[PDB]
Write a protein that binds this ligand. Structure first.
Ligand SMILES: COc1ccccc1S(=O)(=O)Nc1ccc(C)cc1Oc1ccc2c(N)nccc2c1
Lengths: 221, 248, 338, 51
């Protein structure tokens, strides 16, 4: 080798050091992705690219929104996708299910789990109890649906609205259980626009995602 | 008579795993990802490869007439490879326990080259054991006394039991955490039973019977031919159990 | 009226299709049937460029056939030296999500862009040694899908807002905006004479533009899905398009129609990248099945596979001397084939 | 509205197409005139290759 070549060799080696050191900081931060229609409370949960940073239980979280036809290929290596849906506007609920069907069934999101936030459930309680709008006018199957007695974890919570919540969630989980093959799982949650506990919920779900990701690495699941 | 029964079966089983092990040793060299789990399996296939090569040659040398000089080189390769592989089954299980107990740490805060370093230590530890067996039992104390060797056989049995405690405990802690999921139960039980009664019974029968005394009528016709055969069954099924299950 | 104009347009659209058929007196296979076949091609990996820690979405060779640039989701461009595998530069990026990188012919500037909607021209040579943003070029509404330099003062970029813009780097403003597409323009290729350029979008249309006039001269519609790649023939009078329908098609300008369709039954995955060789005899194409294919630009004959990537090949490129081929996949590797 | 669309369609229609016969002749002619300068086609001796 010559004299400048060894100086070019050292320039490469130093760049290798910064490349490998910067990668370590990336492995300690979990990347997410926010999705949802307008007036879905998308930007008011944890409180083109518009990044968001926060940490819960000393683990860094990085949350992204775009403002999905074909640029979604870029987010193939995200820890999870955060789908946010209005649970009060029964007019456009079906367009939310159709939105969720494409994300779940997309080719490039086969191994990406989804955290589903059923936002604005405070309006949902007010709407169904007010006795003006009826869900059956938008989903005929509602009149023949019974609240599953297996789960009733809603304390201090009205019974009529309870039937509506377990029906909105059912219409989103049947899609997840339709064609998932156990590669990715859906985690549903019911949130208001005042709940400060949403950062915890992502942490617990992103812990199960990584736990499953580690189990599949060891051929256990 | 009975020798040709197990010896022929041992060699055939040895060849089934010896060529299967090389496939794993070749398949993981093409990969460039090399996650933590694959490194232990790669070092397990190499460690298992040497053991069957020693066992295939030793058992084949029983059929035709064989000399006594080579038996001084096959043995301290067979053992150096035998103990190394067992310490990787224990290492793999320990990391399964950590991967489930602490998933965030194992994927985010875990040191990247932890798997590579720990595999070297186990290789070194298997080599420190061999020198202690050779020095304390052989030429360096041939004329001194014959009661220095029993210490090397005691440490070896103690080493064997430690690997069983680590494996069985690590597999059990993972099960408790999960209950506190069908392929989990099958894989964990399989990785424990196959270890305990296929690779464990050799070594615990070869070394306890030098530290102690027992009748020679059954020492060979019952618990040496069979033990050396089950030993060749563990080290052949490991590539299937730990790597090739993902291929089907 | 809406229907009155539609009747004028539909008859006109039928006229173009009908007039286009008054020219296909023969097919490419028939005219080129009696030639010597290329035969099997066995190209091997010569260099592997480790260093990227995330998916790779773009690369571009320099004009000296020695230095190349590579973009990745780790957030850094790397200007490699293919001869000796060193890392000449490593530019950190404001936005990690990058879809395109470019290398200027002069060798002085490197561009990039992605979901940040901004085009970032970087300066390679300056005082103090550091590499910093020479200028950021905004104004687009969608994600930057492809960037190609014309000179050290002009750059042509296509984005997902169905438009391509020509820029003056010194001014930082758009000179010409090319409309006519109805979908995301995900590729563009420049003619060797830097007077014309083509673009392929999700509307299954390959439009040819004029760099100076600003109009759209022709519109090629022969595909059935989104065109993910496009590349000019070395003569400058043909181009190849690769869509998600697992088909590459060779079009032409003076004929203004399609001449060949490269497809096989086994290949069902999409086509990510396409480029030609120096002589225009081999069409290289990247696929989602993790391997490259070598096609025959005159006999439609499959002639080879460059299979070395664990993940999908996202970019591909041929040096200006026909000496090497670079392949980059999501597994964070660049393999310099030859 | 659609007037811009039909203005471009008229402009694209008024061009001088030529036959595929002359199109394929040139494409064959170009490759035959440059088949010695494509090392990806013809392998070169390792002395001259830079890899
Ligand atoms: C290092 O080999 C040595 C070391 C010492 C004495 C003899 C040999 S040997 O060369 O005979 N090997 C050998 C090979 C095969 C067999 C079936 C027996 C052998 O004998 C041994 C091996 C290990 C022994 C051990 N761990 N404790 C006590 C006695 C031992 C005897």
């Amino acid at each position: 080798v010559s004299a400048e070549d060894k100086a070019a060799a050292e320039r490469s080696k130093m760049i290798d050091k910064n490349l490998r050191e910067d990668g370590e900081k990336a492995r300690r931060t979990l990347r997410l992705l926010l999705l949802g229609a307008d007036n879905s409370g998308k930007s008011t949960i944890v409180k083109g690219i518009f990044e968001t940073k926060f940490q819960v239980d000393k683990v860094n979280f990085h949350m992204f929104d775009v403002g999905r036809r074909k640029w979604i290929q870029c987010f193939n290596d995200v820890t999870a996708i955060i789908f946010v849906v209005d649970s009060s506007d029964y007019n456009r609920l079906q367009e939310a299910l159709n939105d969720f069907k494409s994300i779940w069934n997309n080719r490039w999101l086969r191994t990406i789990s989804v955290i589903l936030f059923l936002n604005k459930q405070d309006l949902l309680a007010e709407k169904v109890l007010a006795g003006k709008s009826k869900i059956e006018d938008y989903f005929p199957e509602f009149a023949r649906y019974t609240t599953p007695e297996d789960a009733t974890p809603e304390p201090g919570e009205d019974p009529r609205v309870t039937r509506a919540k377990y029906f909105i969630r059912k219409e989103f989980v049947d899609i997840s259980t339709a064609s998932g093959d156990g590669r990715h799982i859906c985690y549903p949650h019911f949130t208001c626009a005042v709940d400060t506990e949403n950062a915890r919920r992502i942490f617990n779900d992103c812990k199960d995602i990584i736990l499953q990701m580690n189990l599949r690495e060891y051929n256990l699941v | 008579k009975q020798t040709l029964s197990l010896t022929v079966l041992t060699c055939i089983v040895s060849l089934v795993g010896l060529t299967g092990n090389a496939v794993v040793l070749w398949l993981l060299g093409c990969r460039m990802r090399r996650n933590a789990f694959s490194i232990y399996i790669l070092n397990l296939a190499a460690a298992d490869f040497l053991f069957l090569s020693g066992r295939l040659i030793y058992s084949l040398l029983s059929f035709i007439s064989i000399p006594h000089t080579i038996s001084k080189i096959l043995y301290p390769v067979m053992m150096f490879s035998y103990f190394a592989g067992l310490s990787f089954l224990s290492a793999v299980s320990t990391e399964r326990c950590l991967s489930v107990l602490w998933p965030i740490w194992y994927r985010c805060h875990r040191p990247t080259h932890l798997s590579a370093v720990v595999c070297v230590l186990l290789w070194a530890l298997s080599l420190l054991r061999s020198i202690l067996e050779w020095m304390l039992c052989g030429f360096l104390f041939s004329g001194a006394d014959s009661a220095w060797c029993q210490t090397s056989d005691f440490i070896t049995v103690a080493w064997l039991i430690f690997l069983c405690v680590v494996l069985c405990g690590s597999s059990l802690v993972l099960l408790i955490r999960i209950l506190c999921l069908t392929r989990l139960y099958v894989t964990i039980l399989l990785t424990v039973l196959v270890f305990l009664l296929c690779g464990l019974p050799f070594g615990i029968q070869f070394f306890l019977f030098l530290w102690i005394h027992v009748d020679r009528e059954v020492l060979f016709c019952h618990v040496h031919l069979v033990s050396i055969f089950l030993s060749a069954l563990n080290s052949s099924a490991n590539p299937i159990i730990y790597f090739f299950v993902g291929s089907f | 009226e809406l229907d009155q104009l539609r009747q004028e347009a539909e008859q006109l659209k039928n006229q173009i299709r009908d007039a286009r058929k008054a020219c296909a007196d023969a097919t490419l296979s028939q005219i080129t049937n009696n030639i010597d076949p290329v035969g099997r091609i066995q190209m091997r990996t010569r260099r592997t460029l480790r260093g990227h820690l995330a998916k790779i979405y773009a690369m571009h060779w320099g004009t000296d056939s020695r230095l190349l640039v590579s973009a990745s989701q780790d957030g850094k461009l790397i200007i490699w030296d293919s001869y000796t595998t060193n890392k000449v530069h490593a530019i950190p990026l404001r936005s990690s999500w990058v879809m395109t990188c470019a290398y200027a012919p002069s060798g002085n500037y490197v561009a990039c862009g992605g979901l940040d909607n901004i085009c970032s021209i970087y300066n390679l040579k300056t005082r103090e040694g550091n590499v910093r943003v020479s200028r950021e070029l905004a104004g687009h509404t969608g994600y930057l899908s492809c960037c190609r330099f014309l000179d050290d003062n002009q750059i042509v970029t296509s984005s997902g807002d169905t438009t391509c813009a020509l820029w003056d780097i010194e001014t930082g403003q758009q000179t010409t905006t090319f409309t006519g597409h109805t979908g995301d323009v995900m590729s563009l290729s420049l003619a060797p004479d830097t007077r014309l350029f083509v673009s392929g979008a999700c509307d299954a249309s390959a439009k040819l533009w004029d760099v100076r006039e600003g109009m759209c001269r022709q519109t090629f519609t022969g595909h059935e899905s989104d065109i993910n790649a496009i590349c000019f023939f070395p003569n400058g009078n043909a181009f190849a398009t690769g869509s998600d329908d697992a088909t590459c098609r060779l079009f032409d300008l003076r004929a203004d129609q399609e001449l060949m369709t490269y497809s096989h039954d086994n290949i069902i995955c999409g086509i990510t990248s396409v480029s030609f060789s120096k002589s225009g005899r081999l069409l290289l194409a990247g696929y989602d099945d993790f391997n490259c294919n070598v096609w025959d630009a005159l006999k439609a004959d499959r002639a080879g596979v460059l299979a070395g990537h664990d993940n999908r090949v996202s970019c591909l490129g041929v040096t200006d001397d026909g000496m090497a081929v670079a392949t980059g996949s999501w597994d964070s590797f660049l393999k310099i084939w030859n | 509205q659609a007037r811009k669309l039909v203005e471009q369609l008229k402009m694209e229609a008024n061009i001088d197409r030529i036959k595929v016969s002359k199109a394929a002749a040139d494409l064959m002619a170009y490759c035959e005139a440059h088949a010695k300068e494509d090392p990806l086609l013809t392998p070169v001796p390792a002395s001259e290759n830079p890899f």
